[PDB]
Write a protein that binds this ligand. Sequence first.
Ligand SMILES: *[C@@H]1O[C@H](CO)[C@@H](O[C@@H]2O[C@H](CO)[C@@H](O[C@@H]3O[C@H](CO[C@H]4O[C@H](CO)[C@@H](O)[C@H](O[C@H]5O[C@H](CO)[C@@H](O)[C@H](O)[C@@H]5O)[C@@H]4O)[C@@H](O)[C@H](O[C@H]4O[C@H](CO)[C@@H](O)[C@H](O)[C@@H]4O)[C@@H]3O)[C@H](O)[C@H]2NC(C)=O)[C@H](O)[C@H]1NC(C)=O
Ligand SMILES: *[C@@H]1O[C@H](CO)[C@@H](O[C@@H]2O[C@H](CO)[C@@H](O[C@@H]3O[C@H](CO)[C@@H](O)[C@H](O)[C@@H]3O)[C@H](O)[C@H]2NC(C)=O)[C@H](O)[C@H]1NC(C)=O
Ligand SMILES: *[C@@H]1O[C@H](CO)[C@@H](O[C@@H]2O[C@H](CO)[C@@H](O[C@@H]3O[C@H](CO)[C@@H](O)[C@H](O)[C@@H]3O)[C@H](O)[C@H]2NC(C)=O)[C@H](O)[C@H]1NC(C)=O
Ligand SMILES: *[C@@H]1O[C@H](CO)[C@@H](O[C@@H]2O[C@H](CO)[C@@H](O[C@@H]3O[C@H](CO)[C@@H](O)[C@H](O)[C@@H]3O)[C@H](O)[C@H]2NC(C)=O)[C@H](O)[C@H]1NC(C)=O
Ligand SMILES: *[C@@H]1O[C@H](CO)[C@@H](O[C@@H]2O[C@H](CO)[C@@H](O[C@@H]3O[C@H](CO)[C@@H](O)[C@H](O)[C@@H]3O)[C@H](O)[C@H]2NC(C)=O)[C@H](O)[C@H]1NC(C)=O
Ligand SMILES: *[C@@H]1O[C@H](CO)[C@@H](O[C@@H]2O[C@H](CO)[C@@H](O)[C@H](O)[C@H]2NC(C)=O)[C@H](O)[C@H]1NC(C)=O
Ligand SMILES: *[C@@H]1O[C@H](CO)[C@@H](O[C@@H]2O[C@H](CO)[C@@H](O)[C@H](O)[C@H]2NC(C)=O)[C@H](O)[C@H]1NC(C)=O
Ligand SMILES: *[C@@H]1O[C@H](CO)[C@@H](O[C@@H]2O[C@H](CO)[C@@H](O)[C@H](O)[C@H]2NC(C)=O)[C@H](O)[C@H]1NC(C)=O
Ligand SMILES: *[C@@H]1O[C@H](CO)[C@@H](O[C@@H]2O[C@H](CO)[C@@H](O)[C@H](O)[C@H]2NC(C)=O)[C@H](O)[C@H]1NC(C)=O
Ligand code: NAG
Ligand code: NAG
Ligand code: NAG
Ligand code: NAG
Ligand code: NAG
Ligand code: NAG
Ligand code: NAG
Ligand code: NAG
Ligand code: NAG
Ligand code: NAG
Ligand code: NAG
Ligand code: NAG
Ligand code: NAG
Ligand code: NAG
Ligand code: NAG
Ligand code: NAG
Lengths: 128, 423, 423, 120, 120, 120
Amino acid sequence: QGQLVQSGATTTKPGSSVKISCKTSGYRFNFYHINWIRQTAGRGPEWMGWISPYSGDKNLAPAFQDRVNMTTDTEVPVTSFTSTGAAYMEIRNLTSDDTGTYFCAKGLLRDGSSTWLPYLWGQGTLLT
Amino acid sequence: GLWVTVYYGVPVWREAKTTLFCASDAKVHNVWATHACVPTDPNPQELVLENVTENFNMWKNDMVDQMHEDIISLWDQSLKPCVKLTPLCVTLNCSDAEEIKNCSFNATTELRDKKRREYALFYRLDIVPLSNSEYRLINCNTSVITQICPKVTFDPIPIHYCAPAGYAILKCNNKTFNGTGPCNNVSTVQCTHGIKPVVSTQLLLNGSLAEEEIIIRSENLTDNVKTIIVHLNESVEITCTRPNNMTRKSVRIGPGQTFYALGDIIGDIRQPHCNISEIKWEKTLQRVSEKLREHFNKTIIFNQSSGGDLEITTHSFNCGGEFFYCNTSDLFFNKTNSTITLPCRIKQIINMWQEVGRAMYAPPIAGNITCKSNITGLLLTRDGETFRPGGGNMRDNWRSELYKYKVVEVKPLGIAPTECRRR
Amino acid sequence: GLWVTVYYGVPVWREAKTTLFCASDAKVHNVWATHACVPTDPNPQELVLENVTENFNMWKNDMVDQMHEDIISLWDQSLKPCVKLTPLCVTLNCSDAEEIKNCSFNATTELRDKKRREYALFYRLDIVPLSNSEYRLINCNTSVITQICPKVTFDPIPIHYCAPAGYAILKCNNKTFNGTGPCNNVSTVQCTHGIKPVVSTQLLLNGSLAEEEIIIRSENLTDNVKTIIVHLNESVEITCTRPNNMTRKSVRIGPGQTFYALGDIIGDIRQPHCNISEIKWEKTLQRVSEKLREHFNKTIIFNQSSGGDLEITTHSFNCGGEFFYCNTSDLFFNKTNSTITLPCRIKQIINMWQEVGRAMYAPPIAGNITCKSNITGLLLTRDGETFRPGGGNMRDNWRSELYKYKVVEVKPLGIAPTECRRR
Amino acid sequence: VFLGFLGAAGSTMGAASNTLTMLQLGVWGFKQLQARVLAIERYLEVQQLLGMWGCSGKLICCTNVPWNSSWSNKTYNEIWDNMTWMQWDREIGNYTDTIYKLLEVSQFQQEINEKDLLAL
Amino acid sequence: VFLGFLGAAGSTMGAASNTLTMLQLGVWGFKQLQARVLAIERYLEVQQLLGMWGCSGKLICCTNVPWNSSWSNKTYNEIWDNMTWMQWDREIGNYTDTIYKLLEVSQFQQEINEKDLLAL
Amino acid sequence: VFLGFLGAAGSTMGAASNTLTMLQLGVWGFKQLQARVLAIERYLEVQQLLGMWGCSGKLICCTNVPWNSSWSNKTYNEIWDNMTWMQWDREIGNYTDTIYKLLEVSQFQQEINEKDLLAL
Ligand SMILES: *[C@@H]1O[C@H](CO)[C@@H](O[C@@H]2O[C@H](CO)[C@@H](O[C@@H]3O[C@H](CO[C@H]4O[C@H](CO)[C@@H](O)[C@H](O[C@H]5O[C@H](CO)[C@@H](O)[C@H](O)[C@@H]5O)[C@@H]4O)[C@@H](O)[C@H](O[C@H]4O[C@H](CO)[C@@H](O)[C@H](O)[C@@H]4O)[C@@H]3O)[C@H](O)[C@H]2NC(C)=O)[C@H](O)[C@H]1NC(C)=O
Ligand SMILES: *[C@@H]1O[C@H](CO)[C@@H](O[C@@H]2O[C@H](CO)[C@@H](O[C@@H]3O[C@H](CO)[C@@H](O)[C@H](O)[C@@H]3O)[C@H](O)[C@H]2NC(C)=O)[C@H](O)[C@H]1NC(C)=O
Ligand SMILES: *[C@@H]1O[C@H](CO)[C@@H](O[C@@H]2O[C@H](CO)[C@@H](O[C@@H]3O[C@H](CO)[C@@H](O)[C@H](O)[C@@H]3O)[C@H](O)[C@H]2NC(C)=O)[C@H](O)[C@H]1NC(C)=O
Ligand SMILES: *[C@@H]1O[C@H](CO)[C@@H](O[C@@H]2O[C@H](CO)[C@@H](O[C@@H]3O[C@H](CO)[C@@H](O)[C@H](O)[C@@H]3O)[C@H](O)[C@H]2NC(C)=O)[C@H](O)[C@H]1NC(C)=O
Ligand SMILES: *[C@@H]1O[C@H](CO)[C@@H](O[C@@H]2O[C@H](CO)[C@@H](O[C@@H]3O[C@H](CO)[C@@H](O)[C@H](O)[C@@H]3O)[C@H](O)[C@H]2NC(C)=O)[C@H](O)[C@H]1NC(C)=O
Ligand SMILES: *[C@@H]1O[C@H](CO)[C@@H](O[C@@H]2O[C@H](CO)[C@@H](O)[C@H](O)[C@H]2NC(C)=O)[C@H](O)[C@H]1NC(C)=O
Ligand SMILES: *[C@@H]1O[C@H](CO)[C@@H](O[C@@H]2O[C@H](CO)[C@@H](O)[C@H](O)[C@H]2NC(C)=O)[C@H](O)[C@H]1NC(C)=O
Ligand SMILES: *[C@@H]1O[C@H](CO)[C@@H](O[C@@H]2O[C@H](CO)[C@@H](O)[C@H](O)[C@H]2NC(C)=O)[C@H](O)[C@H]1NC(C)=O
Ligand SMILES: *[C@@H]1O[C@H](CO)[C@@H](O[C@@H]2O[C@H](CO)[C@@H](O)[C@H](O)[C@H]2NC(C)=O)[C@H](O)[C@H]1NC(C)=O
Ligand SMILES: *[C@@H]1O[C@H](CO)[C@@H](O)[C@H](O)[C@H]1NC(C)=O
Ligand SMILES: *[C@@H]1O[C@H](CO)[C@@H](O)[C@H](O)[C@H]1NC(C)=O
Ligand SMILES: *[C@@H]1O[C@H](CO)[C@@H](O)[C@H](O)[C@H]1NC(C)=O
Ligand SMILES: *[C@@H]1O[C@H](CO)[C@@H](O)[C@H](O)[C@H]1NC(C)=O
Ligand SMILES: *[C@@H]1O[C@H](CO)[C@@H](O)[C@H](O)[C@H]1NC(C)=O
Ligand SMILES: *[C@@H]1O[C@H](CO)[C@@H](O)[C@H](O)[C@H]1NC(C)=O
Ligand SMILES: *[C@@H]1O[C@H](CO)[C@@H](O)[C@H](O)[C@H]1NC(C)=O
Ligand SMILES: *[C@@H]1O[C@H](CO)[C@@H](O)[C@H](O)[C@H]1NC(C)=O
Ligand SMILES: *[C@@H]1O[C@H](CO)[C@@H](O)[C@H](O)[C@H]1NC(C)=O
Ligand SMILES: *[C@@H]1O[C@H](CO)[C@@H](O)[C@H](O)[C@H]1NC(C)=O
Ligand SMILES: *[C@@H]1O[C@H](CO)[C@@H](O)[C@H](O)[C@H]1NC(C)=O
Ligand SMILES: *[C@@H]1O[C@H](CO)[C@@H](O)[C@H](O)[C@H]1NC(C)=O
Ligand SMILES: *[C@@H]1O[C@H](CO)[C@@H](O)[C@H](O)[C@H]1NC(C)=O
Ligand SMILES: *[C@@H]1O[C@H](CO)[C@@H](O)[C@H](O)[C@H]1NC(C)=O
Ligand SMILES: *[C@@H]1O[C@H](CO)[C@@H](O)[C@H](O)[C@H]1NC(C)=O
Ligand SMILES: *[C@@H]1O[C@H](CO)[C@@H](O)[C@H](O)[C@H]1NC(C)=O
């Protein structure tokens, strides 16, 4: 199971910097990478980056290398295998080209060769 | 093609109830854990369970219910060979030395037919006025009295509760743990830490300390009958003493039966009591007040014990070898430098582990008694927002220290499919 | 290329302390080893350890300290259900029948309120004169008295001390073994030989014999406080008897409590004593003299016991069911045919295993008592060269028989390199 | 001694299992003994079962029983790289005794197959 | 029963190992029972270790650990033809637990090698 | 648990073996414990012997000892198709310990044969 509810679909103008939330449930937030992926209307779906809610290790695309701040606060234990974590992500020199729906998705597994693969997706957040 | 593969030794555990055994440090003569226990490994090995959370419940733990019975089963075996005071249940012709009394009684001697007239001092609490200043021991109308063998001591020393092989102990280390529910960062240990069996009431003496904050613990805080257990990070230092320089006096009551009585008060007649710093106790009590407002969004209050038996109303404990009973009214009266002093009394006929009818006589410790102890917690009770202290049961004392630990079976058989096939 | 090779079952052993269990031959009713023990294999299997030497130390053995406690733990369980003589600690109006006394006392009857006037005979030793010929039992001023259940017997029968599985017993067989240090020709046994618990003082009765010479044994012979233990190859036959034809008399002292007293002396009044042959004891004592000159190159001497309690000064032991106390002055007076006779007395209130305050009443054996026993050793004590006999402790008796044996763990895991490699 | 190998209880199944990186008769005298008997009763609970499957002295013994997909229809990659031994046990806990019986007959028949093989 | 095989304790290591030639609750009731529990606690002390090295049911099991010459730099001929098991144990007693741990990992990895081998 | 496999006690030997188809210290506290120790003393009575014959974890282990016809001069067909394990045991009960000793030396020598084999 698990559900990643995102933030609100609020809009800003260029030069600003908005933060997008992603509140997880029903799964161990530390066990899987959180992954943000942007669907720009005038481009192909672009992968932005995963961070490790356990290791605290991040990995972005070179197109967002010095432009995105992705963070996570600690998880709240609910039971033996259920936690509630929050995922945050910003963009630096933001313009209007970055217009589109932003998604957050947790990783596939926690081992092997397909560890971080965005398996379970969120609700998306409309920007503009 | 996937086939069953058997794994021996898999990181999986159950939840069962086993019999724990005691380990002890390098020291002999105490009722708790004499040479009975194995030596503690000088390096208690603790390995951390990474990526693990567990559901603790200090209020449905079995190490507590097993420790509560273990402690009670300890005194029963140590009081088994000692001397009975059943011949002492005679008539007493008493007079004041009404705090303590100088009492005379006719006593049996080394011979069965000759009688002797002895005198002995007796605290007023250990005696009842029967239907011309003639008195009677307090617990002869309903119980059998057994005197402590005057060599064993009740000095609380650390007890190490260990689980058998093939079992494990899971320890929580979240320094905010409510005592119930999911705790992460859990680690396993072969044995618990050193735990001193400190038997007190209202105030928890010589206990562990919270590393951060002050952790309130209970099952259901919504009713009232559930005992609140305060934990503390700042320990207020209490100092108690019975200043009456006392004398031990061996009396002849029967063949090989030399019961030890309260002989004489050398020096001044004074009063036993305890001291706490005014600014410090008022500081750390205006601290527990800050934490009760979190759950009850009202104004908290401290009155005093509602009444009843002497042991529940008082701050009963042990000190030097004699059992104190302190009136704690000057501690709990919530009023948001100097020092405070609690009037304490002393009993010799006490009845711990409230059995059917087994009393206990503590032989008088000769000389000047003084003990300084740390108050590291409380145990409050809420009215149907006022908080008067009181002891729900003696197992409350063991809970406040065993909240971290939780005993588990271990299951080595691991069954799961793989791409292998025998032969 | 050498690689580790594991061997299970290697001839190597450690030195540990385990709990030994008792085996017994084909016979019931004695305090030592009733039906409690397993039957002894009629062929005690002993295999010889060729090419082996071992370091024994009879004075730091644990089978002795374990046997000494085992024997004491035996009587305590057999005296647990028996009858107390605490009501008998009354006033006694005595008269001579001052060796033994005819004493009268007021006694409780089958009913709790009616009193009876009984008479009973009492040895002078079991009684003390209290502050007009009124007396008192000797151990009512400091101890609780327990009468032996008059059915159990103290007849010494062979005890087989066996080691648990996974342990072993190493036996020395050098017929000159000092008791300490390297012994060769060692052999292992599953169980020790039959050992009779013969509790005596000064003179060792019904013990084992040295095959050659007479082996002196002790820790440090250079001081004096270390008890010398003589072993012998020639056993002097002693003959003891209490000739007073006695009568048993059941007295009514309480519900189901029929204590058995000394009734009446039928026949002559005579004296208990022991006989040893003059030429034989003088021969084998002029023999122990020859061996003490080896280590102390001086002139040896035998005086008598220095004094103190009655049990240390005397040759105390058991005979027929009553406990003798013989004055051994006519045995130890070193003067480099006829017969010698030792004046013995008899107690009924004895206190073996010198506990805190537990006395023991031996019910009188009716009739003529006569026992003949072998004296196979001694236990001397040297002055700061004179040798006066005396018992250092009752474990000295067990040492003189367990000097051969020594308990060991066995270690089956053998790790050593070989030219093999798995797979 | 070291029977507490729970060190990898929160790790994935394949990361943990496939590639590691004198008494006195009183209340501490009879307590310490029952704790000593209660431990080896249970070590022989499992080592007997390990002997009834042809797995004596083996931590990882392969068997001769195909995986009934009704037990768990999940992939090797979503077991040994996603689940932990603690929660996998709970998911497959209901059929745990059916597999035991079936393991037992696979080894018993394997004992007589080699019996017919060594008869030649 | 016959656990006393010490018969060749004074013989050379290679001459010995390589080529052989109803109670009542009283003080004998609780003594005889603890002696019965104390024996099988220790038989399972070693038979468990023998199972953790792939040596169950073997008196002479060869391993997969080379001999570290720092343990003992002595020849086969000055061990199995000169020393006795009693004194060899004492000489190599210090490294006895390092070899145990190392034996344990050699067998654990050997358990997964055959696991990768039987997967084909 | 299921140590009562006597279900085929009246069947022929070959039809049965070859092709199957918290106490309180009182008198129930010390009784129930001795019954628990008395059970595993005897399970280790046999599992130790099974280890001394190279039969750990085996229900049917073939050995290296020829059948001495003085033990029983009877045919395979008049044993495994005519007799039952209960009565066969009684007929061959006298030589039962000679075979044990002899089984023990066959396995011990087999342990050193493979030792000489793995040395190459
Ligand atoms: C507890 O639970 C957590 C959460 O599940 C576990 O953390 C996860 O562990 C798994 C392995 O079991 C991880 O999968 C691996 O992921 C790495 C990706 O990290 C690599 O790349 C980083 C970016 O380039 C790089 O910075 C890393 O290098 C260092 O940095 C980090 C910290 O900054 C440190 O953690 C690293 O160890 C390095 O020190 C790192 O190189 C990926 O490379 C792995 O792939 C290889 O390995 C697998 C087998 O594991 C193999 O199949 C592949 O083919 C390849 O060879 C592997 O996918 C996962 O990323 C972790 N984090 C999650 C899931 O969020 C933790 O292990 C658990 N511990 C215990 C004790 O239970
Ligand atoms: C408690 O009460 C008992 C009596 O029940 C007191 O015992 C009595 O004590 C006094 C003083 O010690 C004794 O009198 C003294 O006698 C001696 C010797 O003659 C003399 O030195 C004094 O001048 C005085 O006369 C008295 O005899 C004694 N009674 C007995 C029976 O011994 C006891 O003192 C009281 N103690 C306390 C602490 O209350
Ligand atoms: C809480 O812990 C403190 C500290 O251990 C306890 O104080 C201790 O009290 C005991 C008993 O009175 C003291 O023993 C005494 O020691 C003195 C000097 O060593 C000696 O003269 C006495 O005969 C007696 O043996 C002990 O010293 C003292 N510890 C310290 C450090 O002062 C206190 O009693 C405990 N509180 C409770 C309720 O158990
Ligand atoms: C020990 O002392 C007791 C007394 O404390 C002696 O008991 C008394 O013994 C004499 C002789 O047996 C009794 O007198 C006899 O009475 C009978 C019947 O009338 C008669 O046959 C004799 O001629 C003589 O008069 C006497 O009654 C008896 N007292 C009691 C209360 O029974 C006992 O004999 C003494 N025994 C020894 C061995 O010292
Ligand atoms: C040292 O060993 C000798 C020989 O065993 C002990 O002599 C034995 O003493 C007992 C107790 O007095 C005798 O028992 C008695 O037997 C006779 C006839 O069988 C019977 O009439 C009595 O009622 C009693 O049961 C036993 O016969 C006797 N043994 C022999 C061979 O004469 C001696 O007591 C031992 N010494 C010590 C200090 O234990
Ligand atoms: C997890 O629990 C462990 C306790 O079991 C904590 O580990 C200790 O942390 C302190 C702080 O540096 C060290 O000095 C100790 O050496 C650690 N103990 C061990 C056994 O490693 C740890 O801090 C806890 N982690 C959290 C986040 O609470
Ligand atoms: C009373 O309280 C003081 C203060 O907390 C205790 O002092 C600490 O004692 C522990 C004992 O393990 C030491 O490790 C610490 O170093 C001490 N720290 C400080 C700041 O004092 C004292 O031990 C307590 N005494 C009792 C009997 O509980
Ligand atoms: C070595 O010790 C053994 C005792 O364990 C002695 O063996 C006995 O010797 C006598 C004398 O002939 C034989 O009758 C016995 O049958 C032997 N016993 C066994 C078990 O063989 C042996 O004499 C000792 N050797 C020395 C040199 O003292
Ligand atoms: C008293 O001493 C004699 C002489 O030593 C003992 O007689 C021996 O007894 C043993 C007992 O095992 C026999 O095996 C011997 O054959 C006897 N030999 C001789 C020469 O008598 C007698 O048994 C001893 N009695 C006691 C009770 O110790
Ligand atoms: C009690 O004691 C007082 C004073 O010692 C004495 O006057 C009185 O007679 C006594 N009464 C009794 C009943 O013992
Ligand atoms: C003890 O009894 C005697 C009577 O024998 C009496 O005189 C005395 O007052 C009594 N004392 C007490 C304290 O009862
Ligand atoms: C026993 O004595 C107590 C003393 O406080 C008294 O209150 C109670 O009524 C008495 N009860 C009985 C049953 O004797
Ligand atoms: C401990 O539990 C509390 C419960 O609210 C939580 O807030 C805190 O973060 C936990 N500490 C950890 C996980 O280190
Ligand atoms: C105790 O803390 C747990 C943490 O999970 C919480 O769920 C529970 O409601 C708390 N109960 C009380 C009485 O504080
Ligand atoms: C102890 O905990 C209380 C909780 O409110 C906090 O206010 C105080 O600062 C803490 N003191 C220390 C010394 O940690
Ligand atoms: C509780 O608090 C105040 C202080 O005296 C008062 O109303 C009341 O008497 C106290 N005691 C009670 C309610 O038992
Ligand atoms: C306790 O002390 C207060 C005053 O400090 C007093 O009013 C009260 O009566 C006392 N109670 C007891 C039981 O001693
Ligand atoms: C003691 O006994 C003698 C003789 O039997 C008798 O004369 C005397 O009165 C008795 N005395 C006592 C105090 O019993
Ligand atoms: C027993 O008591 C009575 C008084 O009832 C007395 O006459 C007799 O002398 C007493 N006898 C002894 C031996 O004390
Ligand atoms: C007890 O009685 C003995 C008898 O020998 C006497 O010597 C001793 O002084 C007495 N001691 C005590 C404490 O009663
Ligand atoms: C026994 O030990 C003594 C010790 O001096 C020795 O002289 C004697 O030869 C030994 N007996 C043997 C080795 O048979
Ligand atoms: C006892 O004999 C041993 C034999 O090795 C010897 O070393 C030791 O000095 C002797 N000690 C005494 C006290 O005779
Ligand atoms: C007994 O040993 C002594 C030791 O000096 C010796 O003189 C005597 O001849 C020995 N006697 C026998 C019969 O062995
Ligand atoms: C020791 O020996 C002689 C013999 O009478 C003498 O000098 C002395 O009195 C005896 N007794 C001693 C020294 O106690
Ligand atoms: C022992 O007997 C001697 C004479 O044989 C005598 O002088 C001595 O006093 C007696 N000692 C004892 C305690 O009987």
